[PDB]
Amino acid sequence: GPSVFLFPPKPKDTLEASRTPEVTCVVVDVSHEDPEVKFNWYVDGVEVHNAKTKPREEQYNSTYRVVSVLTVLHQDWLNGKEYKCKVSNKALPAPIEKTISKAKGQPREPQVYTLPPSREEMTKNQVSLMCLVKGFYPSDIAVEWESNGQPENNYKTTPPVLDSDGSFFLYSKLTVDKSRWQQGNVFSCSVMHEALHNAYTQKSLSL
Amino acid sequence: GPSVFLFPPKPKDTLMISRTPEVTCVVVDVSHEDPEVKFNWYVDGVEVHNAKTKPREEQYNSTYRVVSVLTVLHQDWLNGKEYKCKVSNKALPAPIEKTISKAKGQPREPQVYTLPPSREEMTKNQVSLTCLVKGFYPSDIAVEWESNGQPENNYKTTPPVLDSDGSFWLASKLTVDKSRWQQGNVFSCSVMHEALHNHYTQKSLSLS
Amino acid sequence: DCAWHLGELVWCT
Ligand SMILES: *[C@@H]1O[C@H](CO[C@@H]2O[C@@H](C)[C@@H](O)[C@@H](O)[C@@H]2O)[C@@H](O[C@@H]2O[C@H](CO)[C@@H](O[C@@H]3O[C@H](CO[C@H]4O[C@H](CO)[C@@H](O)[C@H](O)[C@@H]4O[C@@H]4O[C@H](CO)[C@@H](O[C@@H]5O[C@H](CO)[C@H](O)[C@H](O)[C@H]5O)[C@H](O)[C@H]4NC(C)=O)[C@@H](O)[C@H](O[C@H]4O[C@H](CO)[C@@H](O)[C@H](O)[C@@H]4O)[C@@H]3O)[C@H](O)[C@H]2NC(C)=O)[C@H](O)[C@H]1NC(C)=O
Ligand SMILES: *[C@@H]1O[C@H](CO[C@@H]2O[C@@H](C)[C@@H](O)[C@@H](O)[C@@H]2O)[C@@H](O[C@@H]2O[C@H](CO)[C@@H](O[C@@H]3O[C@H](CO[C@H]4O[C@H](CO)[C@@H](O)[C@H](O)[C@@H]4O[C@@H]4O[C@H](CO)[C@@H](O[C@@H]5O[C@H](CO)[C@H](O)[C@H](O)[C@H]5O)[C@H](O)[C@H]4NC(C)=O)[C@@H](O)[C@H](O[C@H]4O[C@H](CO)[C@@H](O)[C@H](O)[C@@H]4O)[C@@H]3O)[C@H](O)[C@H]2NC(C)=O)[C@H](O)[C@H]1NC(C)=O
């Protein structure tokens, strides 16, 4: 029979007041003979009826993909509520239930440090601006860059790594043309995390 | 029926001439009624005969784990040779075959840069020494830290990240008591990777 | 020349 995968909202959605975070229950391996899927959702065990089903989608490997999406409020998620999807289908012996919530444990404020390029790097076409983010719990976070109010898109960021004290850290690397760095431009690393003040900080770096 | 998983040598083993790299062919779900497994090995298509079978290991779930190990030359592996294990067993309608090798593509030399703690970190009990390694291919690498010849073990290193030019990068962070940093101790990031001279470089970091 | 790591031989060219 079918299989279920339940997915959290994007960290950015839960951390920006403007965005709409949601929880996603994906059912794959739904047969052509029995495409009907029943969804029951519960929030800390209390059934709710506001979920919206996405348009059904043919996979062309004998099966449908069926998706129910539940909107959630920012503070319900951040307050650690648990979301449960229960899927019933005539090819299952019994309904399948899955649950998901934010990770558990004391939240901890990220420490954000920017690191200029090494002198050894100054003979290259482009240089590396580092943004070290450490000491944060849980692992949900979003990191971006900008300059003169404008988004700087040429960066890569590592996944969060578990550290020896039980928090996480990551690095983000923004690559810029050496000439831009030498000319005095200010570049900024912007961090969104639940345990930050207004869930946002930004740190600046310049020659 | 039985299943097969083939595993590469450790990067460190392929890069240190003092170590011995090997590739390993693991057969799980071997039945009690048909425990006999036959291995053929091939290198770039050509059969080799120097593999050796490890002691048979019974498992919690009433099946055997059988394992063949093939030693390999540093240079064959680093030159990208392909190693194939073929497994035959009565409980198999047909032999299983698996192959593995280094990742394909021109190797590129890591650039290794050490980065001191931010001035802002200077209020903490402990501070972060960063080793940035970028522009390297393939992704097989080893990073370790030391001071005065002794290993400094209180570090964590990120997995390799695929960059926009087709090479990889990572960072290694070592955490030390601020007083050790203040006392002028010299710390060193050691990187081992195929496309380095003698496979090895070391960059130092101290209070300025 | 040769490279060593914590006294252990890495590689020589
Ligand atoms: C028929 O085909 C289908 C479809 O597959 C496609 O088509 C076929 C023809 C092929 O071409 C495929 O290559 C195509 O993908 C097959 O369906 C697959 O079944 C698999 C289960 O057997 C399932 O594997 C599980 O994947 C999990 C991760 O899923 C992620 O990431 C994958 C790839 O990285 C991606 O394809 C998925 O879509 C899914 O992506 C996430 O989706 C969520 C939900 O939308 C996103 O979250 C939302 O995003 C929005 C914004 O848009 C919003 O912010 C919401 O708030 C938010 O919730 C999320 O961002 C997406 N992430 C990414 C990275 O894209 C694994 O975790 C899981 O592993 C776990 O379980 C394993 C055991 O089952 C364990 O071993 C393991 O440890 C884990 O615990 C599974 O591997 C595939 O995802 C699934 N493909 C699809 C499209 O659903 C089907 O198998 C096949 N049938 C047959 C008979 O052959
Ligand atoms: C009966 O039970 C057995 C035994 O199960 C074990 O014991 C029980 C009690 C449980 O706790 C299990 O969790 C235990 O493992 C079952 O056997 C298992 O079957 C699995 C598949 O069914 C198989 O999964 C595959 O694992 C791959 C990774 O395996 C690694 O890592 C795991 C855990 O991290 C470890 O247990 C494995 O042994 C294996 O470890 C590596 O071994 C290699 C070779 O030895 C090491 O490399 C060598 O190292 C030496 C020095 O040590 C030297 O450096 C050599 O040069 C070098 O070659 C390597 O370092 C070890 N790594 C680690 C981390 O320790 C996955 O890659 C693989 O995924 C792939 O395939 C999937 C499809 O299944 C895909 O989803 C995916 O995309 C991948 O392509 C699988 O997940 C388990 O490994 C296997 N367990 C063991 C011990 O063999 C058996 O299934 C069960 N039967 C039944 C019917 O129930």
Side-chain angles (χ1 to χ4, degrees), chain A residues 110-117 128-134 136 141-146 155-159 169-175 187-192 201-205, chain B residues 115 118 128 130 132 158 169 171 173:
Chain A
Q111 294 156 232
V112 180
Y113 304 116
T114 65
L115 313 174
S128 315
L129 309 192
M130 300 307 279
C131 181
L132 165 55
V133 193
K134 64 164 233 145
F136 61 88
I141 192 171
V143 182
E144 297 173 351
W145 289 83
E146 78 185 46
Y155 64 84
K156 297 279 180 167
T157 300
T158 72
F169 75 89
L170 59 69
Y171 288 80
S172 192
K173 175 169 82 68
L174 172 72
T175 301
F187 291 89
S188 288
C189 170
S190 274
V191 182
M192 290 154 259
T201 196
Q202 146 172 107
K203 305 278 166 169
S204 273
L205 173 70
Chain B
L115 308 176
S118 153
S128 313
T130 297
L132 175 60
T158 68
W169 72 279
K173 173 173 69 81

Side-chain angles (χ1 to χ4, degrees), chain B residues 5 7-10 13 22-24 26 28-29 59 61 63 65:
Chain B
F5 299 87
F7 297 93
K10 298 287 172 288
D13 291 350
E22 69 197 38
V23 306
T24 307
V26 180
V28 312
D29 285 342
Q59 304 296 292
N61 53 14
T63 69
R65 195 194 190 239

Side-chain angles (χ1 to χ4, degrees), chain B residues 154-171:
Chain B
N154 190 52
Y155 68 90
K156 297 276 186 178
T157 296
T158 68
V161 184
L162 182 66
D163 219 350
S164 61
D165 72 357
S167 92
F168 294 94
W169 72 279
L170 66 58

Side-chain angles (χ1 to χ4, degrees), chain B residues 4 29-30 41 51 67 72 76 82-83 93 101 105 109 126 128 134 140 159 166 173 177-178 183 191 206-207:
Chain B
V4 179
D29 285 342
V30 179
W41 285 92
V67 175
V72 307
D76 294 10
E82 301 201 353
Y83 298 89
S101 68
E109 187 188 320
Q126 274 178 355
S128 313
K134 60 187 245 70
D140 306 312
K173 173 173 69 81
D177 290 5
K178 190 162 68 200
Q183 185 191 75
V191 178
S206 65
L207 169 86

Side-chain angles (χ1 to χ4, degrees), chain A residues 3 5 7-10 13 21-24 26 28-29 59 61-63 65:
Chain A
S3 279
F5 300 92
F7 297 90
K10 285 290 167 308
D13 298 352
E22 53 208 43
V23 159
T24 309
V26 183
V28 296
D29 282 346
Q59 304 297 300
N61 60 1
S62 70
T63 75
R65 190 182 183 257

Side-chain angles (χ1 to χ4, degrees), chain A residues 6-32 34-37 39-74 76-118 120-123 125-187:
Chain A
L6 189 56
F7 297 90
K10 285 290 167 308
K12 205 184 181 181
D13 298 352
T14 78
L15 294 175
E16 285 193 320
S18 33
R19 323 224 156 172
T20 288
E22 53 208 43
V23 159
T24 309
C25 185
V26 183
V27 180
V28 296
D29 282 346
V30 180
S31 70
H32 281 63
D34 288 294
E36 303 78 7
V37 184
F39 292 106
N40 296 99
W41 287 88
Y42 317 72
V43 186
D44 296 321
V46 174
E47 180 166 16
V48 306
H49 301 93
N50 52 327
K52 273 167 144 282
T53 305
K54 293 285 211 200
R56 182 175 74 178
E57 223 81 81
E58 170 67 81
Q59 304 297 300
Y60 306 109
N61 60 1
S62 70
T63 75
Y64 297 109
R65 190 182 183 257
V66 178
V67 181
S68 183
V69 182
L70 187 62
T71 307
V72 305
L73 303 188
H74 302 76
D76 289 340
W77 179 264
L78 293 182
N79 285 351
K81 292 172 165 266
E82 295 202 356
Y83 296 84
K84 177 200 263 178
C85 185
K86 183 173 102 152
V87 171
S88 314
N89 175 261
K90 297 221 100 197
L92 268 41
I96 293 155
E97 304 189 25
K98 297 285 173 151
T99 295
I100 48 100
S101 71
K102 192 176 80 168
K104 318 199 100 184
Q106 189 105 6
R108 273 168 85 187
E109 174 165 49
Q111 294 156 232
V112 180
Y113 304 116
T114 65
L115 313 174
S118 169
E120 262 200 41
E121 204 178 28
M122 298 292 186
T123 52
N125 281 162
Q126 311 175 318
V127 296
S128 315
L129 309 192
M130 300 307 279
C131 181
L132 165 55
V133 193
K134 64 164 233 145
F136 61 88
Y137 192 89
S139 61
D140 296 317
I141 192 171
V143 182
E144 297 173 351
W145 289 83
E146 78 185 46
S147 192
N148 304 321
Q150 292 309 304
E152 288 292 309
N153 290 327
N154 201 40
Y155 64 84
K156 297 279 180 167
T157 300
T158 72
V161 174
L162 178 60
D163 202 342
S164 52
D165 78 356
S167 63
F168 297 83
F169 75 89
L170 59 69
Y171 288 80
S172 192
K173 175 169 82 68
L174 172 72
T175 301
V176 299
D177 276 321
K178 178 171 78 232
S179 56
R180 288 178 78 203
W181 173 251
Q182 277 161 160
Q183 285 161 7
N185 292 106
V186 180
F187 291 89

